Amino acid sequence: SKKQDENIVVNKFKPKEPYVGRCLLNTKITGDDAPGETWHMVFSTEGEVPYREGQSIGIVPDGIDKNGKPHKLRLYSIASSAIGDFGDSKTVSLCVKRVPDGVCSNFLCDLKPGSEVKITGPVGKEMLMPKDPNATVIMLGTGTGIAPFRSFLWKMFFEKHEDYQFNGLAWLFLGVPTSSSLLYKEEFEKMKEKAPENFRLDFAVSREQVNDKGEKMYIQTRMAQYAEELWELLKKDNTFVYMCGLKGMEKGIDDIMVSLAAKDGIDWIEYKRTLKKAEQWNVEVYW
Ligand SMILES: Cc1cc2nc3c(=O)[nH]c(=O)nc-3n(C[C@H](O)[C@H](O)[C@H](O)COP(=O)(O)OP(=O)(O)OC[C@H]3O[C@@H](n4cnc5c(N)ncnc54)[C@H](O)[C@@H]3O)c2cc1C
């Protein structure tokens, strides 16, 4: 395919017999004055989980349900590239937002180094990277939605690859409520200064920023500033749009795309269906 699916591995570890990894790192990446708290953790895999950029892993949280049975698996987009945060292909990283009255999210953030974690998968087919190293990769994320895009960009800019020398256009749109909620801001800044021509970056901080019209700077609001440019980019054959994050973010984006497409006489619902079948528009949103 147009993607990176060359003998991909999906479901090597099932919830019955999961891979029992161990926590190596677990850092709160969000500020102390952040609305909630997102934690970046690194687990040992010893090169047992053959995951790729875009893939997710399952986490069976330690505990029992209401009817005396082990907990259900919760999916999490892998925040680290194939070779991972240590560059040894023996680790896996996540980007977990702590949710109130949540079992898996709370367990993961409360994980102490050395404590074992039940890992399943890898899971995922949609969010894989495009094979073309000259392709225009447009990543639209909100909060924890940055996880596959961090994975993507690490391969692109923080890694040496003979098989993959990226010289196209990586555009990242990251939507968060506050500046203290900005995830991996530092990594992306280092990237833009290292590759100014290849990497484009845009942050949409709804509670702090505002536009010309004075509306809250959500992802779609930030996108609207380049609406003419992006629309003309979407028209290209080498353009690959990726959307990850919270469920709600899809409505806002399609809303601004509906108006653009209207201007040319195209119905955005039937147009995004055409792009989705062409692997050019990829979505992975969650509750
Ligand atoms: C493909 C994919 C990728 C994902 N990527 C990430 C990611 O990168 N980072 C991330 O943080 N999340 C990610 N998620 C979401 C993740 O899977 C979790 O849903 C999220 O982390 C919260 O997990 P949880 O176990 O705490 O939720 P849950 O505990 O299942 O839900 C918590 C809420 O549900 C209510 N609830 C549910 N059952 C009961 C009950 N029986 N009685 C009373 N209340 C109940 C609680 O009141 C509470 O408010 C992803 C999901 C998908 C599908």
User: What approach was used to elucidate this structure?
Assistant: X-ray
Cα 250 from Cα 172, distance rounded (Å): 16
Non-local (6+) Cβ contacts of 287 within 8 A are: 246, 247
Cα 243 from Cα 164, distance rounded (Å): 22
State in Å: Cα 65 to ligand 1 middle: 14
* DSSP, res 183: S
| Residue 74 assigned ligand-binding role | yes
List the domain boundaries for the chain.
Answer: 1-123, 124-287
What count of other Cβ atoms lies within 10 Å of the Cβ of residue 178? Answer: 15
What count of other Cβ atoms lies within 10 Å of the Cβ of residue 258? Answer: 15
* DSSP, res 143: G
Alpha helical stretches, state H, 160-212: 185-194
| Residue 89 assigned ligand-binding role | no
| Residue 66 assigned ligand-binding role | no
Q: The tokens of 273 are what?
A: 């269906």
State in Å: Cα 134 to ligand 1 middle: 36
Supply the CATH classification number for the domain 124-287.
3.40.50.80
Which residue in 230, 215, 226, 225 sits closest to 281, CA to CA?
230
Number of H helices, E strands in the chain: 7, 11
Q: Is 19 exposed, middle or buried (0-12, 13-18, 19+ CB in 10 A)?
A: buried
Which residue in 221, 236, 264, 121 sits closest to 168, CA to CA?
236
284 labelled catalytic: yes
How many residues does the structure list for the chain?
287
136-142, strands of its sheet edge to edge: 199-205, 169-176, 136-142, 239-246, 281-286
Q: Which residues pair with 38 in a beta bridge?
A: 97
Give the closest residue (by CA) to ligand 1 atom 18.
Answer: 74
Q: The tokens of 228 are what?
A: 């003419």
> What is the enclosing helix (H) or strand (E) of 276?
helix 268-277
The Cα angle at residue 47 between residues 41 and 48, in degrees rounded to 5: 95
229 labelled catalytic: no
Cα 181 from Cα 217, distance rounded (Å): 14
Question: Which of 28, 99, 139, 283 to probe ligand 1 with, by most ligand atoms within 8 A of CB?
Answer: 99
Which residue in 204, 142, 132, 201 sits closest to 170, CA to CA?
201
Q: Which CATH superfamily is domain 1-123 in?
A: Translation factors (2.40.30.10)
What count of other Cβ atoms lies within 10 Å of the Cβ of residue 248? Answer: 11
Cα 207 from Cα 184, distance rounded (Å): 19
Measured from CB, residues less than 6 Å from any atom of ligand 1 are 56, 66, 74-77, 95-97, 99-106, 144, 147, 284, 286
